[PDB]
Design a protein around this ligand. Sequence first.
Ligand SMILES: O=c1cnn([C@@H]2O[C@H](COP(=O)(O)O)[C@@H](O)[C@H]2O)c(=O)[nH]1
Ligand SMILES: O=c1cnn([C@@H]2O[C@H](COP(=O)(O)O)[C@@H](O)[C@H]2O)c(=O)[nH]1
Lengths: 257, 257
Amino acid sequence: TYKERAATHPSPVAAKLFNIMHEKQTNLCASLDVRTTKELLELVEALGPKICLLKTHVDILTDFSMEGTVKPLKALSAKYNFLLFEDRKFADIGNTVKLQYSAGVYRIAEWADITNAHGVVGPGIVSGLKQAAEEVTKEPRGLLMLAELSCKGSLATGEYTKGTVDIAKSDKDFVIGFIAQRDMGGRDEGYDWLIMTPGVGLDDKGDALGQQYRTVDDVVSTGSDIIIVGRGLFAKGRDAKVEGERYRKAGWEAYLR
Amino acid sequence: TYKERAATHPSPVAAKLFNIMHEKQTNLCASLDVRTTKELLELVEALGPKICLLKTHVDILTDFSMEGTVKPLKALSAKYNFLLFEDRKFADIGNTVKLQYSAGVYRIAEWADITNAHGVVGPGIVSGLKQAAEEVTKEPRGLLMLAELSCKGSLATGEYTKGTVDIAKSDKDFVIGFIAQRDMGGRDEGYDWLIMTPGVGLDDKGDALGQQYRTVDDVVSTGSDIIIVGRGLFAKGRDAKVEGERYRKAGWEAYLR
Ligand SMILES: O=c1cnn([C@@H]2O[C@H](COP(=O)(O)O)[C@@H](O)[C@H]2O)c(=O)[nH]1
Ligand SMILES: O=c1cnn([C@@H]2O[C@H](COP(=O)(O)O)[C@@H](O)[C@H]2O)c(=O)[nH]1
């Protein structure tokens, strides 16, 4: 169970997340990909009590600022009890990602509990991101490797996926799991990887740019620990609060089954 | 020759770049990866006369701004005659990259002549980026696919590289070439791909985070059209202006051979 995994997971970030999921009876991660901080904060407020994690793309915000975007996000995170996951998908050499994660305008390492990286770069990407994390904050940080993607024509399969899983094995305390479409095993080698799965929608089938959706029951059935839902919650005139409860209920019941 | 390829290339961006390389006798691309706009502008000024392209990571700048960073960069670009390449390495689903490329704080599509993307996502990444480019500006834009990386343990090989090359084949006018470590062929299929190669250094062997360097003569001999040099130009107390001429000379002579 999530509660049991919280006590045995080497990562304090994964542990806190598992506890949040148990306490709030939710394995839903909201991906409120809107372009203004104002709307983002309104949506986060509406989804707050129903999520365990908020996945953000701060780089699609036309008005990002540390004081106006990050501080309010941290306040909501504390108020409603959910972690912050900046979906930056780092994918450059170690030295460059260290610079991109630690500072710049977004100063991601300062506030995001979790972030992610593509395995394409090799082991150096993990080393670079961790060095950045330790140089900027004393707060625990977690990293997810991108093992698979939900988009049409994805190349994150076969040997590439295996190579990405190998990269993840280098740091059990820092690399907490994967963004993937199925279980990645690892139990046999002392790994308890969190499996977070995007490309989840109960209504949409996909979009005009390669996105593909699978149902909640479907992904949970293949090993997903957390469902990441974006447009299924807030787009096309949908009521985020209502969709939030709807998806939380579906994800939690699937987990219980 | 570069001059000949400028007349036959389907991309007006590649065409302009080839003409610049011929007129200035340079195939050097500077990667002045510093953290302040002030230092960046000083370095670009010093390298201007010796480069055909400026590769930037605006997301490592602690003080980025359209008026204070981009405007000056465009002015230097016009003053010294070189193009702008924002090395953002897009690697998300089509819908997300469209948003990340067209707006946010960096508004990359508004000023960068060239940008790049990882093939891991599938063909949707090219569609999303092109749609973003056309909705934001009428100026011609070019895209480079990341076929290979210079870092240790890179997974950008074999089947993954092939899949990335296939994605590039979808748009001859927009996808101008690759970031790669060797020739990618394509001539038999009617492609004249620009090969830009990072991980180039005449002195450094590598760094502490997986970077590996090859000499100018070595990469040009394997098919590189443009050499991308960062720390070899400005780091470790080096005199950027002097290194600029040194690398330009080396790259041009290797090309002439
Ligand atoms: O395999 C995938 C697919 N999508 N995403 C991200 O998850 C969200 C999916 O949103 P959607 O439900 O609106 O399609 C977007 O932010 C997208 O960048 C991933 O991280 N990986
Ligand atoms: O295969 C590679 C390796 N590095 N880079 C980028 O090129 C530059 C190389 O810089 P360096 O010469 O200082 O190592 C950096 O900006 C790095 O992000 C790439 O695009 N691809």
